Structures are given as C-alpha cells and as structure tokens.
Amino acid sequence: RPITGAEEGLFAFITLNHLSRRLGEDPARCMIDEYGVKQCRNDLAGVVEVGGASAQIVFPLQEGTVLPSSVRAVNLQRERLLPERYPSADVVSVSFMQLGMA
Amino acid sequence: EKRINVGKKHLQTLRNLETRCHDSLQALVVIDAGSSSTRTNVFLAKTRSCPNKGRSIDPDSIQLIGAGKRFAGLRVVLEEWLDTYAGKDWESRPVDARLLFQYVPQMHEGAKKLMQLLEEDTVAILDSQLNEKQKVQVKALGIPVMLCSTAGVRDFHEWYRDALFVLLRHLINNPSPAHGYKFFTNPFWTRPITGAEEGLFAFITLNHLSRRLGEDPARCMIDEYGVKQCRNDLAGVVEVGGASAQIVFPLQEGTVLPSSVRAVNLQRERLLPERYPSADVVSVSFMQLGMASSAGLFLKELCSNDEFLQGGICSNPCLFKGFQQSCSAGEVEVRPDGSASVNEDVRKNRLKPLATYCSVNNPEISFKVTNEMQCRENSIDPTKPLAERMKIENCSIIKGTGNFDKCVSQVESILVAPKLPLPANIEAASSGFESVDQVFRFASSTAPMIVTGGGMLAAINTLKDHRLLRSDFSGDVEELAEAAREFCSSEVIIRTDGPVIQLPNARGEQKLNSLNFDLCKTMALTVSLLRHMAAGENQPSFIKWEKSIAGPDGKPLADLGWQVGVILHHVLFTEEWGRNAYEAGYSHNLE
Amino acid sequence: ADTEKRINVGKKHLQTLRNLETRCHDSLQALVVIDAGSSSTRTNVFLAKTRSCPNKGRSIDPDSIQLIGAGKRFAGLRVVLEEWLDTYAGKDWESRPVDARLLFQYVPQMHEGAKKLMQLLEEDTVAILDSQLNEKQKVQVKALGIPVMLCSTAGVRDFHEWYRDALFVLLRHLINNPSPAHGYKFFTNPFWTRPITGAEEGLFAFITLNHLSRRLGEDPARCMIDEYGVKQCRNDLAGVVEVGGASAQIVFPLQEGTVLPSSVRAVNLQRERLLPERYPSADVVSVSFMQLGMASSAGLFLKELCSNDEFLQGGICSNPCLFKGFQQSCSAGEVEVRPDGSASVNEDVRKNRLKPLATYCSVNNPEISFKVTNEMQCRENSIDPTKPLAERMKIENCSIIKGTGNFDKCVSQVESILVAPKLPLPANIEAASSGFESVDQVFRFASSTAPMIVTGGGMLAAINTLKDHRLLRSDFSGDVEELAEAAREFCSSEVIIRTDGPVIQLPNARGEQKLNSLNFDLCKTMALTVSLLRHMAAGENQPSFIKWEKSIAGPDGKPLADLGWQVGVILHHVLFTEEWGRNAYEAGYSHNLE
Numbered sequence A: 001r002p003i004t005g006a007e008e009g010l011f012a013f014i015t016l017n018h019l020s021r022r023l024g025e026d027p028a029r030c031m032i033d034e035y036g037v038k039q040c041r042n043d044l045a046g047v048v049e050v051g052g053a054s055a056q057i058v059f060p061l062q063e064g065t066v067l068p069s070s071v072r073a074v075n076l077q078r079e080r081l082l083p084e085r086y087p088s089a090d091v092v093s094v095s096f097m098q099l100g101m102a
Numbered sequence B: 001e002k003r004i005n006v007g008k009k010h011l012q013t014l015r016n017l018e019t020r021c022h023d024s025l026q027a028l029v030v031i032d033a034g035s036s037s038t039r040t041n042v043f044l045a046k047t048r049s050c051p052n053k054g055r056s057i058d059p060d061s062i063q064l065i066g067a068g069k070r071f072a073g074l075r076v077v078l079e080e081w082l083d084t085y086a087g088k089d090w091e092s093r094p095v096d097a098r099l100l101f102q103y104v105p106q107m108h109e110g111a112k113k114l115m116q117l118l119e120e121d122t123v124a125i126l127d128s129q130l131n132e133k134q135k136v137q138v139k140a141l142g143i144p145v146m147l148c149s150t151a152g153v154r155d156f157h158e159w160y161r162d163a164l165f166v167l168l169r170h171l172i173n174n175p176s177p178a179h180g181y182k183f184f185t186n187p188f189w190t191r192p193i194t195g196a197e198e199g200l201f202a203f204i205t206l207n208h209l210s211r212r213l214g215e216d217p218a219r220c221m222i223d224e225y226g227v228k229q230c231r232n233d234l235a236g237v238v239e240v241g242g243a244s245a246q247i248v249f250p251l252q253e254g255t256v257l258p259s260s261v262r263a264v265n266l267q268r269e270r271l272l273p274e275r276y277p278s279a280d281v282v283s284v285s286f287m288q289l290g291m292a293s294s295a296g297l298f299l300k301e302l303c304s305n306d307e308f309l310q311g312g313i314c315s316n317p318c319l320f321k322g323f324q325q326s327c328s329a330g331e332v333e334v335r336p337d338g339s340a341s342v343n344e345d346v347r348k349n350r351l352k353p354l355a356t357y358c359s360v361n362n363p364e365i366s367f368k369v370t371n372e373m374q375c376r377e378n379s380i381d382p383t384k385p386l387a388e389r390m391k392i393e394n395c396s397i398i399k400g401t402g403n404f405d406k407c408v409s410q411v412e413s414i415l416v417a418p419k420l421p422l423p424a425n426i427e428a429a430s431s432g433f434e435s436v437d438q439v440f441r442f443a444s445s446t447a448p449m450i451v452t453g454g455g456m457l458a459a460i461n462t463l464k465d466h467r468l469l470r471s472d473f474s475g476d477v478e479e480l481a482e483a484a485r486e487f488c489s490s491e492v493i494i495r496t497d498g499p500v501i502q503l504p505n506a507r508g509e510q511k512l513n514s515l516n517f518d519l520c521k522t523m524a525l526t527v528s529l530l531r532h533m534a535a536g537e538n539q540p541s542f543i544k545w546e547k548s549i550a551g552p553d554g555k556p557l558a559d560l561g562w563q564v565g566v567i568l569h570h571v572l573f574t575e576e577w578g579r580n581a582y583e584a585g586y587s588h589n590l591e
Numbered sequence C: 001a002d003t004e005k006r007i008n009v010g011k012k013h014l015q016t017l018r019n020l021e022t023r024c025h026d027s028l029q030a031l032v033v034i035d036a037g038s039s040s041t042r043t044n045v046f047l048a049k050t051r052s053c054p055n056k057g058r059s060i061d062p063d064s065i066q067l068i069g070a071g072k073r074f075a076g077l078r079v080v081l082e083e084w085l086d087t088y089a090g091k092d093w094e095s096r097p098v099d100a101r102l103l104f105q106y107v108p109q110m111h112e113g114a115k116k117l118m119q120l121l122e123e124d125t126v127a128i129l130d131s132q133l134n135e136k137q138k139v140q141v142k143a144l145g146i147p148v149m150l151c152s153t154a155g156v157r158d159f160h161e162w163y164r165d166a167l168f169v170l171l172r173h174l175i176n177n178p179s180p181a182h183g184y185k186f187f188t189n190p191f192w193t194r195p196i197t198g199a200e201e202g203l204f205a206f207i208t209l210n211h212l213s214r215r216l217g218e219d220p221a222r223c224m225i226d227e228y229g230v231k232q233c234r235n236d237l238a239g240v241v242e243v244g245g246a247s248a249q250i251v252f253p254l255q256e257g258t259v260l261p262s263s264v265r266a267v268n269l270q271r272e273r274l275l276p277e278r279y280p281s282a283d284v285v286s287v288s289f290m291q292l293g294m295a296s297s298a299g300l301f302l303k304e305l306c307s308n309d310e311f312l313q314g315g316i317c318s319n320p321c322l323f324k325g326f327q328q329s330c331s332a333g334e335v336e337v338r339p340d341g342s343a344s345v346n347e348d349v350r351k352n353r354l355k356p357l358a359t360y361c362s363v364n365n366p367e368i369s370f371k372v373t374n375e376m377q378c379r380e381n382s383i384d385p386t387k388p389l390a391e392r393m394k395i396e397n398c399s400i401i402k403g404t405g406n407f408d409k410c411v412s413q414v415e416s417i418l419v420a421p422k423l424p425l426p427a428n429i430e431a432a433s434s435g436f437e438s439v440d441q442v443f444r445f446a447s448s449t450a451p452m453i454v455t456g457g458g459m460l461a462a463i464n465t466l467k468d469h470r471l472l473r474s475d476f477s478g479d480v481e482e483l484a485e486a487a488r489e490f491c492s493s494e495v496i497i498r499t500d501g502p503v504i505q506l507p508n509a510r511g512e513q514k515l516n517s518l519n520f521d522l523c524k525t526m527a528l529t530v531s532l533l534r535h536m537a538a539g540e541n542q543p544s545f546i547k548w549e550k551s552i553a554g555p556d557g558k559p560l561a562d563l564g565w566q567v568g569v570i571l572h573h574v575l576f577t578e579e580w581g582r583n584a585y586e587a588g589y590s591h592n593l594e
C-alpha cells in the first residue's frame, strides 16, 4: 500500500529504536504516577530524517509535558504500530514536504 | 389441597426475589458553572442491581426534576480574590502569581460561601420534589455531583483555576450531615470543560432525549470484507449561548475530510462506549458568536467602517430608530427615563473576553503563527494595551437606523463569512474550521438541525408573539426576513411608564430593556445562518427551534444543553461508573 | 524574607489536598460467618481493611482479616427442621414414608422456626459488634454494609426432599431483613449463604491454614521449566489433617511430577474458582472421610468391635480403647459421664452417633443405589442398607461395654475398622474431592513432601494429655513409636471413684486427672493418630515435618483468626476483586431496598 510522509517518519523511528536495542519488552525506567500506578517506558531515541521528498522528525514526548491543545502526541499502540506488550510510546511526529532535498 | 399451591407459590416468589434484578432510585447533580452564573441541576435516574453483575443506570430513565437559582459565577470568586490580594489593577498590569500562594485559605473562603448556597438550593429541590419512599432510596445510594465550569474561568493563565477546582471538590466532599443527602465528587466528574466539549455534550443530550442515539442502529452498510458498518440517524445542534456558539452535526455519510480539518469520533474521544454505533461529527465552537462577544465585536468592526462612522456618529442598522448610546463596547443598561447607560469598567466591556484572548499574555496566541494577525485584522490588536485594544476611536455616539437588510449584510461580513476570521485553535473536541461560512460550504450534511439558546428562541418567540411569524414557522428564510424587517423597522418611543418599541402601523408594542434593545442582530444572525445552511450542497432534512424534549408520555424529560450529555458520558461506561459511584462512593470520604 | 515561608505553606496545602483526592483511602468493614454445624449454629465476627482507589473501585486487603468474636452456640439447623417435621409431618416421619408434597401447606411455620434462630444470631452478632468496636470504627462499619456468609456443614444433608433448599431461601430472606434499630446493615445472597460439603470444608480449611501461616500469596516460592519450555510456578503450601466432629479432611499439595491413577484427580483451586488466576497454581489431593469424624468414628467403632467374636462374649463387649474400670450400656448413643463415675447412654434415635452413617448407608440414598458395589461396601462396615433405621444401628446380642485399656489391641481395631477396612465406604467424586476411598490409597499413590499440620480439638487433646502427664516430651515431633509408648502407659489407667468424682489413675502412681464426657474415649483418638502417622511414614514421599496446631501466630505474635473453614470461605469471595466489588459494594445492602 502507499504510505504518507508522517507514516514514513513513525516507521523510521521504529527502525532506529529496534536496531539501537532501545525498543523492546524491557522498559528502561518505570515511574509511579499520582495514583500509584507504575508507568513504564523504553528509552527511545528521536530521529531527524531528511529525505528527497520530505523531512521527518519523530521523538518521545518529554515526561510530564502538557502539549498545546492544538497538537497531540501520537500513541504507537493506539495507531496499531506497536503491540500492547511493548511499553507505551507517545511521540511528537512531524513531516514537512518543504524540508525534503528536492 | 389448594393450600399446597400457596406454599409452592410463596417459595417461588421468594426465590424470584433473590435471583432477579432490583430497581432503586438515585439522584444525580450537575452544577452548571457558567460565565455569569452558577446553577444546580437536579436529576433522577433508575438504577438496576443484578446478581453477580453489580449496579448500573438505565439511561432512558434520566429526568430533570429541578434547576435552581442562579448564584454568582466562579469568575466573581477569583476576581474578588485577585482584587484584594493582587491589587485592583491586575487586569491591566503585570501580576506575580507566585505571591498569591500566601492567600489559598482566602480563596477557599470565597468558594465556601458559594458552595454552601448551591448545597442548600440542591437540598431544597430534593425535599420539594421527593416523597418519603423516594427519599429513603436517594439518601441510601449516594448523590454523584458533576460541577463543570464553562466560559468565564478559561482566561486566567496561571495556577488559580486548577487550585479553585481542588477546593470546590473538597467542599462538595464535605456536605452537611444534618440533611442526610450524601453528595460526593471526584476529579473525573468535577472539572472545567471547553466550548467544543460543551458542543459535543449538547449533541449527545439532543440525540439521547429525542431517542436517536441508541445501541440499535438505524442503518448499516456492508464493507468489502462482509463486515457491517452501522450508524444512528442523528440530529445536529446549533447552540448560541451567552459566551460562545457551538455547531455539532453528523459528518455527511460517504465523506472524508482533508488533512487540514478533522471529524470528531465520539467513541475515540471516550464520550460514547463501543457498543453504540460509530458517530463522526463536524464540531465547531466560536467565542465570537456568543451573545456577549458578538455584540462587542459587531460594534468594534462596524464603528471603524467609514460607511457607518461619520463625524463621531456610528449609524448602527441592527439598533432601532430612536435609540442612542455612548460609543463603546461597554455593558448597556436601558434606564427608566429611556436613555442608555454604558458601563465603562474594563470588567464589564463586552470585548473583555476577546481582548483577553487576543493578547501576548495568552499562550494560545503563540500556538499558531497567524493567530496574532487574525486578531489584529479583526480590530483586536494584541500589541495595544488592554484599554486601547477595546476602544472605538473617533466615535462619540451610536444611533440606531433600524435597517434589517443592512444589519444582515454586516452580520455576514463581521460574524458569519468574514474575509479573515478570528483564530480558533483546534483541540480534540473540535474539527478545526475557523468560520461558519467554511462549515456549510465544505462539510454540509442532510442531518436535521435543532436551533437552541435563550437568545435564538427569544428572537423567534418575539416575532410569533407580535403575530409577524406564523406559529407553525419551520425555517423558511424569506418568511423570517420579512417578519424581522417589519419588527426591526420599529421606533423607540419614550413614555411616562418608560421606553417602548412601537411596531409600524399601530400593530403593537413592547417595553425596551437591556436584554432586547439589540435583538435585531440575533434575528439577522438567524437569517444569515439559515441562508448558509440552505446554500449547502446538502441541506438539513428539517430545522426546528427547541428548549426541551418531551418524554414517551408527553411531559418534558429534561432540557437541551450540555448537562444530560455530561451525565451520559460517565453513566454509559458501566464498569467504570459502578466502581466510582458505588464501590468508592460517598464512603471514600470517611475519615 | 518570610514571604517565601507563607508561599511554600500555600503550595504544600494545595499539594496535600491534591494527594488526598488521588490516593487510596482506607476504611474498616465487618464481615460475618455463621457456622451452622451438626449440633450448633454460631456467629463469627470479622474485621477487614477496605481500600478505595480512584477509577479502581473498592477491595479488601486479605492480610487484614481478623476474628473479633465468636458467639454462643445456638440450636443446629437440623433442630429447626426436625421440630417442624415433628409438628406437621406428625410422628414417625423418619420411620414411615412421608408425602413431602403435603408439607408445602406449612411453609410459614418453617419460616417462624427459622425466624426464632436468626433473631438469636442477629442479637448475638450485634452484641459482639457493640462490645468490640469504638465509636469511630462503628461509623465505618455501619456505612459499608455487613456481608453475612451462613454455611451449613453437617446435619441437614440427609433429608432427600425440598426442605433444605426451602430453609436456605427463608434464612437468606431473614438475614436480608435485619432490625433497622441497631444500624448494622447485614445482607447476603445465594452465593455467600449455602450448604457446603465435607470436601469443600477441607479446601476452605486448607486455604485458612496457608493464609494464616503466610504461605499463600501472589508471589511464588519457586518456579520450574516444563518439557515445552514454559515457566511453572507454585507457593510452598502446607497440608492439613482436620479431624472434625462429623468427618476428617486431608488436603495437601500434589507432589511435583506425580502421575495419578486415571480414577483420581488433583483438585485445582483456580479451576474450582477458590483462588484467582493471579495466585500461583495450586493442585491438591483432597479427601473427606465420613467415618473418621469424632462422632461417626465412635459409632462405627462400637458397631464393628461389638459384633466381633473376639470382643463380644455373653452380652459383654470388652473394649480395648476404654479404661479398665469403665463401663456403659451397649449402644452408639451419646455418652455422659456422671459424678458417681457411671456412664449415662442417651438412647434417643436423634442422639445415636451412628445416625449420619446409617442414613448415608441406605438404599434410598442415590450415592449408594447408583453403583452395584456400594450397598455391599456399607454391609461390610456393619451398616446394612436393607435394614430399618433403629435395627440398622442396634448392636445385637450386647448388653454392656467394659473397658480393657489395651492400647495395642485398640490400634489393631482402629486400623481394621476405621483406617484400612476390608471394604472402604464409597468414593466421593464431587468437584472438591480427588475421589480417593481410603488413607492407605492416599499415601500409596499420592504421597508428598509438603509439611503437614494436624488440627482438631480431639487430635490436640490426645497429644496434650500425654505431654501433661510427662509421658511425651514437649519437643515431640511425630515419632510413631514415641507416641505408642506414651499412649500404652496412659491407656492402661484405671478408673477410680473419689469423693470429688471419677478419676483416670495412671499406672506406677504417675498421677491422675478427672474422667469426663469428652476424655473417656480419648485412647481411640490416640490410636487413630498412631495409625495415620504409620500410613504417612509408609509413603514413598515423607512430609518435611508434622506439627499439631491449636492456632497460628500472626505478625504481632497473637493469632488473627481461628483454624477451620471460616477464613477460607471469606477469602474465596474477597480475592475475586471484580466479583466481590459488584456483590458487596455495587449491589450491597441497598439491593434490599423495597
């Protein structure tokens, strides 16, 4: 099937993290939230990819950050990109056709 | 021998009692913390306790039993607290918010007096509406309270509102033990809601009460994989409130919006559970179309236009011939003598919400690059200090000209189809359109539309009371324009008993007051909205003006608005509701 | 300068309030377990800590469960049914076949019978709550509601009509309608209040033991990897031997890698919905022996011993399990030792210790009827199913029983009559039972290395009597020969009549103790102990240790609750978080609103 620039960014983010051994069932840190619920995450690295047609920037949302209402973290489990057994991954995902090489 | 059957039947009766579901009455309270007032809303619901299945609410049973007195708005609590501890010029000068942490008990002090008035009013409603048997059930189950703030408390941009909500929930969770009503809340039920969220909840209220929203779908489509894709036959809502206007309607079947705007999916937003057919909607909320902001913005743009402003006189076509006032967007008070009194206080300026929104102090303006330009180009300059930002230059008097068609053409250019709209940042509950014109030109639907809001209904009822519009009026644009043109050509006559609106050809009159002097602008907004809806590729199957919905019997079940929808979004998620309302319950407050 | 102090106080105050609305809140709850046994109905009052968490509902902390009070012994449920059947089914209802269909005319009279007992239990439960709780505790207890679990063990199992089911419907109705004056909101449902079998009683007593001793928990003690590469986990659970008044239960963990015969099965506590899935898997050998109860073994022992040519001679039964100088009328009736040293035997059919086994061993019992061998298995245990009741229990050609105090002969007869009979009584194959028929079969095919806890009033008195006369060392750890030598000496005692009453006088002037209705036949319990230990010692796998326990010490040293089925019953409900939350809190006492 065809894939968009933003989807190409998320897939490149998954590639980087898999090969770097950052993505996996073992989280790098678990935090006890306001309710006493253990929230676990991998120590994911962000990616800056400047391709021929577009530039993608994908990185995990800063822990305890409140984004403007007008933008949103992309949840990889919600988008069916990562299974539920993987620690929750919330990312800032951006694709700019104007920053591509061409 | 027939004595055996009495015994066998008695045992079966008792066996039926311990195996079947049992019904019990529950009260639920929604506190509407609006811009100008805070009002309690008391509801009744039938709960069902089923062996090994817990306890749930029958959503069809939700009924309003009483709406109370309008107490002061939450904004008053904060404004009085800021006046005392930050200094009287906090609206017009920089404030060190950190220093205000010294005065948290004084903020609690302000919230306590208001909560005590609401608690007494709620108890008064319960006692007057319930019989002794109903009271026993109601007192036993506990009373969930959902206090939601809407407009008036969104523009402080510090720690105040969140701290105020912590204090309000603490107050709700400590009711007086004397009356026996076990009120209780949690941070999921008592919280601020946005304008677009009020829209979604009003949409859910309308469809629930009219019986259009239900588990059983109206129609299904079979996809390429043989899977049923089902939907309900939902009605849209147009709500013009005092602080904002919302438009929410189902996305036209078989359409997809481009990557610049988005349909809101009620299930994805966790407003409706997955067992309800998928509901995709076009959702918009515009502060500038609320009754108060639209009045201020209309004057700000009309009175800076060379066609209307000449030699310090602003000729306003939406105001009656014979009416005049001083030139400012200040709150107008129609006096006993017939003159208009304009309040010049920054706090009472109709432009205050838009000017506070269109500011460099507002982080929302920095969220999107064009925001500041869209403010400036609509005559609300973020670079100008507050008083200069709201001022109408080279203008001493506003005089009414009673020209309905000119009023409509100006509502078109300032409010409905502006060349450059004011900024509206998208949020999870909204579609991203910034203008009503764009909504109907690009995302029109065949779904029926219900027009709601106090002022919208007052505009139609005024024309029907004067017998200028037929009682069976059903939305015809030209019939409405004709009625409104005649009413708006009325002359203001000052008499011994006060000012009157005298209809042409001695066809009646009514008293002129602070609430109706500018009603022609609402009639013009209605004509303009109907015109845009009629010019859409898809037109609503019908259009109606409503305040409430009749139940299966004929009596009103509840009022239109966001309140029923707020309850439903909690009660419909069965497992979560059972845990919070019954397992934790009021007993969570035990010390 | 001190402005920062006032700022930080304001900030802290808001953080204190925010924490208060995001964290779990604790609250006390009372729980009631009504123990409806064979000869009595008694209330048991418990306290537990509940935890209410945002978006999570409310649950009980299982380690907080504590007994606050046990009530008075009121009449047994069998007494309620017999008084109702004595009034409306006339006389000889248990002699002549009765038309049960006609008894439906007398349902309000059954209700009145049950109302009298329930009012007594409700008053007693309220008395315990009022004496044990302070005012702050009462507010919490009254607001949450009081779950009541009434379970009947032995007594009411044998009517074979609609009576028991009807009684239970009436009992729950009474429990669900408590007096509003006291403010205690008692309530029940058909899942909490119901009869329980002997095998289910064993599983509940096994759960109680392992809970109190901190062996049962979510975290496993050890994990293993099977043939497929799957991690298999378990707790290090202790087995229980509970010798009750009506039956004996043996419940212990299945030894790792055991291949059981096709005809018996391990009981899986998770599959049986006794423990949730979050607990490590627990597979057990579960056995309930009808003839090994204090009452039933006493009856059967006399029936078999006193029909054997070696012991019955010219109307005199020489009993090796009774003291020299002791004598009684020849019947299985309840015995009362009187101040002059004489024995009074109650001849009432309802007080005959052979009655439950004789009604069990009937052609009218489907358990017996459905299998050809079953009827013969009863007959070989001296209880003939074709015989009428009173004749079925009679010890023929026998006038008196005289004690001979010969421990070795007592062990030999206990072994051949009770523990390893020529023909065992029929196997029970209900879900809670592994389907074993004898003690030897259990230790031959399913022996385990799990430690074993011996419980039951009579089992403990058998060991403590020997320790008290310094015949057994205080450090006794289960050695068979050490026990047999001690019991041989004690069991050789002579009954002597003094001014103060009858005494058991030990040989070689070692001392004495008062002879009474509870200890006159204790030597048979000493012989049952020797026999049980011998069968366990002959197993391929040996328990790591064997201990006799009256109670289990809590974290603070003092016991939190009693051994027995009561704690286990609470746990099998409270551990199922979602189900408990729905029944106890969502439905609750408000389900009773009318």
Ligand SMILES: [Cl-]
Residues within 6 Å of the ligand: B421, B432, B433, B434, B435, B438
């Ligand atoms: Cl737009």
